Design a protein around this ligand. Structure first.
Ligand SMILES: *[C@@H]1O[C@H](CO)[C@@H](O[C@@H]2O[C@H](CO)[C@@H](O[C@@H]3O[C@H](CO[C@H]4O[C@H](CO)[C@@H](O)[C@H](O)[C@@H]4O)[C@@H](O)[C@H](O[C@H]4O[C@H](CO)[C@@H](O)[C@H](O)[C@@H]4O[C@H]4O[C@H](CO)[C@@H](O)[C@H](O)[C@@H]4O)[C@@H]3O)[C@H](O)[C@H]2NC(C)=O)[C@H](O)[C@H]1NC(C)=O
Ligand SMILES: *[C@@H]1O[C@H](CO)[C@@H](O[C@@H]2O[C@H](CO)[C@@H](O[C@@H]3O[C@H](CO)[C@@H](O)[C@H](O[C@H]4O[C@H](CO)[C@@H](O)[C@H](O)[C@@H]4O)[C@@H]3O)[C@H](O)[C@H]2NC(C)=O)[C@H](O)[C@H]1NC(C)=O
Ligand SMILES: *[C@@H]1O[C@H](CO)[C@@H](O[C@@H]2O[C@H](CO)[C@@H](O[C@@H]3O[C@H](CO)[C@@H](O)[C@H](O[C@H]4O[C@H](CO)[C@@H](O)[C@H](O)[C@@H]4O)[C@@H]3O)[C@H](O)[C@H]2NC(C)=O)[C@H](O)[C@H]1NC(C)=O
Ligand SMILES: *[C@@H]1O[C@H](CO)[C@@H](O[C@@H]2O[C@H](CO)[C@@H](O[C@@H]3O[C@H](CO)[C@@H](O)[C@H](O[C@H]4O[C@H](CO)[C@@H](O)[C@H](O)[C@@H]4O)[C@@H]3O)[C@H](O)[C@H]2NC(C)=O)[C@H](O)[C@H]1NC(C)=O
Ligand SMILES: *[C@@H]1O[C@H](CO)[C@@H](O[C@@H]2O[C@H](CO)[C@@H](O[C@@H]3O[C@H](CO)[C@@H](O)[C@H](O)[C@@H]3O)[C@H](O)[C@H]2NC(C)=O)[C@H](O)[C@H]1NC(C)=O
Ligand SMILES: *[C@@H]1O[C@H](CO)[C@@H](O[C@@H]2O[C@H](CO)[C@@H](O)[C@H](O)[C@H]2NC(C)=O)[C@H](O)[C@H]1NC(C)=O
Ligand SMILES: *[C@@H]1O[C@H](CO)[C@@H](O[C@@H]2O[C@H](CO)[C@@H](O)[C@H](O)[C@H]2NC(C)=O)[C@H](O)[C@H]1NC(C)=O
Ligand SMILES: *[C@@H]1O[C@H](CO)[C@@H](O[C@@H]2O[C@H](CO)[C@@H](O)[C@H](O)[C@H]2NC(C)=O)[C@H](O)[C@H]1NC(C)=O
Ligand SMILES: *[C@@H]1O[C@H](CO)[C@@H](O[C@@H]2O[C@H](CO)[C@@H](O)[C@H](O)[C@H]2NC(C)=O)[C@H](O)[C@H]1NC(C)=O
Ligand SMILES: *[C@@H]1O[C@H](CO)[C@@H](O[C@@H]2O[C@H](CO)[C@@H](O)[C@H](O)[C@H]2NC(C)=O)[C@H](O)[C@H]1NC(C)=O
Ligand SMILES: *[C@@H]1O[C@H](CO)[C@@H](O[C@@H]2O[C@H](CO)[C@@H](O)[C@H](O)[C@H]2NC(C)=O)[C@H](O)[C@H]1NC(C)=O
Ligand SMILES: *[C@@H]1O[C@H](CO)[C@@H](O[C@@H]2O[C@H](CO)[C@@H](O)[C@H](O)[C@H]2NC(C)=O)[C@H](O)[C@H]1NC(C)=O
Ligand SMILES: *[C@@H]1O[C@H](CO)[C@@H](O[C@@H]2O[C@H](CO)[C@@H](O)[C@H](O)[C@H]2NC(C)=O)[C@H](O)[C@H]1NC(C)=O
Ligand SMILES: *[C@@H]1O[C@H](CO)[C@@H](O[C@@H]2O[C@H](CO)[C@@H](O)[C@H](O)[C@H]2NC(C)=O)[C@H](O)[C@H]1NC(C)=O
Ligand SMILES: *[C@@H]1O[C@H](CO)[C@@H](O[C@@H]2O[C@H](CO)[C@@H](O)[C@H](O)[C@H]2NC(C)=O)[C@H](O)[C@H]1NC(C)=O
Ligand code: NAG
Ligand code: NAG
Ligand code: NAG
Ligand code: NAG
Ligand code: NAG
Ligand code: NAG
Ligand code: NAG
Lengths: 154, 191, 191, 154, 191, 154
């Protein structure tokens, strides 16, 4: 009924929490680490695409490591375990926004605010698409303002 | 771009091709050819075409199951696709041929209440990354979705760098897993 | 009614008729007749009655699917209803007549742990607004649910102002959408 | 999984985030607007029938507005989209309460508090029924008192 | 065992025996015998064994449904078990005998990516607590788990103090309810 | 959807809330009452096995009390009602952690802190198992310390 998979990237960090996307998990980018204050929101938020993608990447990493691979690959594991990693109704929302000509998240690009001197970051939010065109950073500038206010509150 | 004087807007793009060892990944080359990849070395090619490769109306699923010469992940994807079709009631519309363990399905799409609409709805969700260019209208139509192509042909294939128009993504297939047997009709009193 | 001296209690009553275009709405007229309107101009009528309309033991769903001729929404509702019946194992209990594209289903309800019990359980959830007056107890009984009536007859009909006893609601159908294929028995090794 | 559909009603309002039920969505009542503080609770809580109904009405409005209508009505859209709009297990709870002779919500009638001078309101809670009879406003007067005690803290 | 001076660590263990009146309870006696108790009366015995009992390839589910001599809860458990098997495609692997209302199901397990793996895959989840000893390895191998035993036999049985290795728990059964029909292959174009 | 079943063990108590595991719901035959603060977290959190078990035990109690038992047992009521009582994907998480040789909850044993003088207790958390052995308390002592910090915070 609800995702339950927990992220674990505590080794070698200054805080037990947080999660890091390596250069293999990212397109034309280096290592990117997000702290506990942002990643901890994924435990509760039910409408964040980035959190679902983090659970997918973490599950993939632990699955290729801790389970013996068969000779020819099977998709049984994800077929059972998808509902513990992601909210499929979030994908349904993005599909509904797509067919109704509303901007929607295709699960590729995300944006976040990074503090200049501290390095603290927000939980990334998805960059929306309409007919193959990304939004132009002015279509949701007030959301960016609200996110900056949220981090200033913290 | 600085907000509130000190907060810089930054972006990242996820490389979902690294998810290939655990789940299928869907992408689009062009408006007609679309692909599902199950890891490397295998996958399905979904092609909208006016050229049919099957002239008969058999499919013979039980014989293929008995011989057991096929890739189980690909047949699972085909089963998910077929069970995700809403209101499928024309069995002659879908032909297939699994001789020798291959996979080759053909949906006859030959404008709101026909089987072509349901097949296209499942198609544009299985290949959600770039299927909008494959349709007559990008958005605004769901019940009366149509394409000019007359057949949707799903054939097993090898891995190449096909993902030209849209990036690889598991989102369509993972979304359609909850759709299996949700909008099917009853054929027999005891299922 | 004022609480804390400044907060006044006020009430709402939602008009669910406006949901007719997007969702099926179910309601009750009296003890025997209940209805499920699919928009305007069409719907299903569920009657608990002692008078049978079908004297044979056929449900030719395959011929109906080949010919189409029926409203796909109504057949979808029938499929959801039947697949929501738990532990259905008597095919002669259900007979049908789809000649000319109509819909006419008849469940023979002729005490604990029987087919009539499961049929009545699905019936009272499909028409959850006002079905409780139709059942013998209406509460404190689920597994041994029963009705004096001998047949449940589901027929396609036209839109009229039927909702006399209970207001229209999509809640029963939307609830039963998740119950499909959850308590169906296996009849084959390969479903 | 979990509901994700978001309500969108901000034009002409003193603040964004509220939602307004028009005269057509109500039985013998006029337009009624609920502020951002009450409607925003619908994004988190999983046991409010009114929030499910708001998402249903909003989805119906958007579907009639934005999608091309077919010649004959089809219920495929709701059959696909229902789990993103509502908690079907809330319906299951209400039905379980119904068969157990416990008061239950039939999703028809709701009650809210309304401050006389400021006009601020709580999120409407469902008025329960039992064998066709509504509760008589004394069966849950302590719930109303607790709700009033919740708004004074805000 | 005090923490922060005043907080004492304390533990509880749940007695799930009391849930027998509402739901199945699955648990393990030894590596060769597992049980699913329904009520204080009935249940299923699941044995991994090298000894056959049916010795033929029939499974007359339709006749058993027609006669209706069986326990509905046990047949529901059997249906959930079978529909939870991923990628089941060899009908000959499953044999049955429901003569007189009993239940006697047999799966032929006679390395990676075949029917025996799927049968064991559902078996170790249907009795989750304590089935790990029955397998070659408790963990590390998932996509092809194996046991030296050649047959899995499911038979209706009366109630007895069977769990000597693991406590009764409904979690194994309740987990598989959502797994039904998620990995079944299509056998017909109209299901 | 997500779980919705509400616990009701308020009569005769000091405060209107909490829940008591009676002598028959526990091994060793003891009565254990948990206050309103601990049990109230079960309404929100989606990753607590103990809360799912509390909902199962309460549903068993209510179903035995309020619904007429059939002559032959039926598992028909739990099949429909399971998704309103438990998060099946929490069971999926524990199965996934089982098959990857990670410690997992089998839903049998739980641990909680207990204040010496006030008698206040936290929400119980599950005692994990790996293979056939329970974890020592030293394997998760930092979690116990964090729980003690959380109780001191409130
Ligand atoms: C959307 O994206 C899809 C997928 O990329 C794309 O499909 C491809 O289209 C191209 C162009 O139509 C196809 O290219 C032709 O394919 C045939 C078939 O051979 C292929 O397959 C065999 C195995 O079955 C392979 O062994 C072989 O190498 C090919 O991969 C080829 O025979 C064609 O080559 C000949 O014609 C070319 C001109 O098109 C010549 O340049 C080439 O030298 C070859 O000459 C031959 O043909 C001459 C007559 O034309 C003849 O005189 C010569 O004697 C000689 O026989 C060519 O490669 C390709 O197969 C399609 N691939 C797939 C996966 O479907 C769609 O076209 C694209 N659509 C859009 C919107 O752009
Ligand atoms: C989500 O939406 C965005 C925006 O619509 C969408 O971004 C587009 O993705 C496609 C697919 O990656 C990009 O196409 C690439 O464009 C570059 C341009 O230089 C080409 O070089 C690429 O082709 C090379 O690589 C391919 C394999 O990746 C090869 O097959 C090919 O032969 C070439 O070697 C490729 O065409 C496109 O540029 C972006 N556009 C934008 C605006 O960023 C994204 O794909 C969508 N994601 C999903 C999951 O749907
Ligand atoms: C939820 O529970 C409540 C309380 O149990 C329940 O309220 C009842 O609903 C029915 C149906 O609307 C009401 O019956 C109506 O009463 C008026 C009295 O003036 C009649 O005029 C109505 O009949 C006319 O209108 C109908 C609808 O257009 C026509 O079909 C009919 O031919 C007449 O023109 C009708 O009988 C009843 O009064 C209320 N009772 C209370 C206490 O409010 C509600 O329906 C339930 N809702 C759901 C979603 O199930
Ligand atoms: C969760 O994991 C734990 C730890 O692995 C696991 O605990 C084990 O449970 C079994 C089953 O109860 C225990 O085995 C018991 O051990 C005592 C030792 O004195 C025996 O007396 C018990 O046998 C008697 O009772 C049985 C049940 O009525 C009878 O069938 C039998 O004939 C005897 O009368 C029984 O063997 C084992 O001791 C614990 N071990 C630990 C480490 O605590 C627990 O079962 C798992 N729970 C679930 C839900 O899977
Ligand atoms: C609905 O189901 C009931 C049974 O549950 C059907 O009634 C049964 O009908 C058969 C005939 O088809 C009856 O058998 C007959 O019994 C009489 C008297 O013994 C005998 O003279 C006849 O030769 C024949 O054997 C059976 O008794 C009767 N049972 C009941 C309970 O009435 C009913 O026909 C079904 N209705 C439909 C429309 O399917
Ligand atoms: C499929 O995913 C795997 C796993 O992420 C990718 O393999 C990685 O490839 C990179 C680049 O060669 C290596 O640095 C990693 O060490 C590899 N990891 C593993 C576990 O093999 C693989 O590249 C992906 N497939 C494709 C076609 O891109
Ligand atoms: C689709 O699958 C078939 C069957 O596996 C592939 O044909 C086989 O190819 C292998 C080598 O890869 C041969 O050893 C088998 O003998 C072939 N079988 C048959 C029946 O021809 C086929 O190549 C696949 N299709 C594509 C386009 O790759
Ligand atoms: C796909 O379906 C079309 C019809 O929708 C079939 O074409 C028809 O074929 C029959 C003879 O079989 C002709 O009498 C009709 O005039 C044709 N109709 C049209 C619109 O062309 C077509 O044969 C089917 N294709 C396959 C491969 O089965
Ligand atoms: C079905 O719902 C629609 C939409 O809510 C109703 O149509 C509205 O009816 C009112 C009253 O006549 C009009 O003012 C609105 O403009 C209509 N809206 C639309 C979008 O058409 C319709 O009345 C309902 N039908 C039934 C039979 O109750
Ligand atoms: C419930 O209402 C229906 C519909 O009005 C009643 O059925 C009608 O009964 C009258 C009187 O016998 C007939 O003239 C109509 O033709 C019937 N209509 C239909 C659609 O069948 C029914 O009798 C009512 N039930 C009860 C128990 O009062
Ligand atoms: C049930 O549906 C059938 C089939 O649509 C209806 O009968 C049709 O009625 C229309 C007019 O509404 C006629 O033009 C068609 O010729 C009829 N078809 C047949 C095959 O006879 C029937 O009226 C519906 N039943 C009810 C009670 O409304
Ligand atoms: C099945 O569970 C029921 C309770 O649901 C158990 O019955 C209880 O047994 C104890 C011990 O004898 C009594 O003190 C209780 O009063 C009983 N409760 C009820 C409601 O009858 C029963 O023992 C369990 N069965 C098994 C085989 O363990
Ligand atoms: C597991 O336990 C069962 C019974 O508790 C054992 O099977 C019994 O074996 C004895 C000795 O041959 C027979 O008399 C009984 O009839 C058998 N019982 C049943 C139910 O079959 C079985 O051998 C045990 N397995 C192991 C490995 O110890
Ligand atoms: C279970 O399956 C095995 C494997 O197919 C069957 O054993 C085969 O039986 C045939 C027919 O007698 C022999 O020709 C094969 O040599 C056997 N194979 C092996 C590997 O032993 C076995 O008969 C099946 N069991 C049942 C009860 O149907
Ligand atoms: C499995 O179920 C069958 C059928 O219910 C049981 O056999 C019946 O047992 C009852 C008494 O419990 C007798 O009255 C019936 O006559 C028996 N029926 C037949 C057809 O023999 C059987 O005992 C059960 N198996 C076990 C191991 O308990
Ligand atoms: C944020 O900015 C700092 C600037 O030094 C950089 O080091 C860090 O990697 C950035 N973090 C993210 C998540 O982009
Ligand atoms: C596919 O990937 C595997 C590793 O997962 C590698 O051994 C194999 O060579 C690859 N095959 C191809 C054709 O790239
Ligand atoms: C999408 O963009 C293309 C141009 O790239 C245009 O032709 C098409 O009309 C657009 N479709 C929609 C739905 O706006
Ligand atoms: C169903 O088909 C059979 C074929 O023999 C026929 O006799 C029967 O009348 C048909 N039933 C209906 C209701 O049309
Ligand atoms: C906490 O400690 C007190 C006193 O030791 C005891 O009465 C109570 O039962 C304990 N808590 C629980 C929930 O068991
Ligand atoms: C589990 O414990 C047993 C001893 O009881 C041991 O033989 C076995 O190797 C263990 N399994 C694993 C996977 O460690
Ligand atoms: C737990 O600690 C005890 C000593 O207190 C030790 O004997 C035992 O082996 C430990 N268990 C595990 C599983 O490490």
């Amino acid at each position: 009924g609800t995702f339950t998979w927990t992220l674990s990237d505590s080794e070698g960090k200054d805080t037990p929490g947080g999660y890091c996307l390596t250069r293999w998990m990212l397109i034309e980018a280096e290592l990117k680490c997000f702290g506990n204050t942002a990643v901890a929101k994924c435990n509760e938020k039910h409408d964040e695409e980035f959190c679902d993608m983090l659970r997918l990447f973490d599950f993939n990493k632990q699955a290729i490591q801790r389970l013996k691979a068969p000779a020819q690959m099977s998709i049984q594991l994800i077929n059972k375990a998808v509902n513990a990693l992601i909210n499929d109704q979030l994908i349904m929302k993005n599909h509904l926004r797509d067919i109704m000509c509303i901007p929607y998240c295709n699960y590729s690009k995300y944006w976040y605010l990074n503090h200049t001197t501290t390095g603290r970051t927000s939980l990334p939010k998805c960059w929306l698409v309409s007919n193959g065109s990304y939004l132009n950073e002015t279509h949701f500038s007030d959301d960016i303002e609200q996110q900056a206010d949220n981090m200033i509150t913290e | 771009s600085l907000y509130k004087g000190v907060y810089e807007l930054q972006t990242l793009e996820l490389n979902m091709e690294t998810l290939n060892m655990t789940m299928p990944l869907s992408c689009t080359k062009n408006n007609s050819h679309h692909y599902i990849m199950v890891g490397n070395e295998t996958g399905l090619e979904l092609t909208l075409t006016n050229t049919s490769i099957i002239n008969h109306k058999f499919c013979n699923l039980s014989d293929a199951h008995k011989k057991n010469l096929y890739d189980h992940a690909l047949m699972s994807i085909i089963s998910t696709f077929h069970l995700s079709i809403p209101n499928f009631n024309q069995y002659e519309a879908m032909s297939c041929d699994f001789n020798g363990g291959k996979i080759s399905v053909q949906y006859n799409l030959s404008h709101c209440g026909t089987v072509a609409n349901g097949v296209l709805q499942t198609f544009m969700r299985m290949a959600w990354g770039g299927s909008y260019i494959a349709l007559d209208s990008g958005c605004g139509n769901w019940d009366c979705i149509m394409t000019s192509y007359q057949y949707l042909i799903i054939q097993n294939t090898t891995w190449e760098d096909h993902c030209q128009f849209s990036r690889p993504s598991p989102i369509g297939y993972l979304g359609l897993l909850s759709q299996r047997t949700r909008d099917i009709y009853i054929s027999r009193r005891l299922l």
